[PDB]
Symmetry: C4
Subunit: 90 residues, 4 copies
């Protein structure tokens, strides 16, 4: 659990660094600085408006943005759902 939430903090920070670089200039409100990025990626992790709100408007400028976001979702969502069911049994 302490390890799982260590992993996910690193994945979160690394993903927000990458996204700040990738989409910062084209999507300033969502990714213009690292703080805007950790927030948006938390939102994307909660699946809230991820495609209609974030990823489709992004794909109109970066057609392959799905290569970043979908695996990100798959990893954080699985890691969160592991952290939660971990803390419980623990």
């Amino acid at each position: 659990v302490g390890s799982v939430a260590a992993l996910l903090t690193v994945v979160f920070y690394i993903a927000a660094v990458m996204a700040t670089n990738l989409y910062g200039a084209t999507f300033p409100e969502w990714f213009g600085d690292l703080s805007k990025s950790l927030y948006t990626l938390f939102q994307v992790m909660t699946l809230e408006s991820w495609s209609m709100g974030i990823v489709r408007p992004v794909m109109n400028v970066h057609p392959n943005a799905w290569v970043f976001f979908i695996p990100f979702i798959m990893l954080t969502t699985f890691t969160v759902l592991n952290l939660f069911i971990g803390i419980i049994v623990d």
Copy 2:
């Protein structure tokens, strides 16, 4: 369960009190009274348009509103998911 759902009820009322104060005058439709607040926070707990619908339009006036909402989400969401998985086992 009985105690978990007591904790979550208190957290819920305290959060709705706090939010009524914090965002009530700037965001009356969502937080103008305690009843509007308990509803909106139930919605935020379900994750339904929490960011594009609530929190981003709020951060345009209160840039740190994320300090309230995100931990609220993390607490309730985890506590809810624990309450439900509790009830189930508690009948096994």
Copy 3:
């Protein structure tokens, strides 16, 4: 499981009957007939756009509509999450 999904079918049909009556005339696209109602309530059960999309536009005509929807959500969501974790162990 067979019992749980019997309960939830009855709750679903009863809720869609009630909603067709309550919000049918004021909200025809969402509740104008029983079929429109079972669909909308499936959507509400998945939590998709439930408040910004359905319940808030409804509360502008029926202020207490939350008395119906919130318990409905609480019941179906708990029953679904019981049916799923049931089938698994079964």
Copy 4:
């Protein structure tokens, strides 16, 4: 897990093939080719704007589209939730 995720991959490809055919010409942005379809159906599996965003605008042209989408959701959502809860236990 290895077999569950094989099943879900096949279901996913078959569904995206079917949807490309069914809704491709009426809804090109969402289903105009198999790649647009696999993406849109991943989104529908996450429940993200599935009804207000996808399925309701689709039912305005294909009134029975719900016969495809709802069972798709029920199948993938259940299978995904089974795959994840499988992996976890499979390492206990």
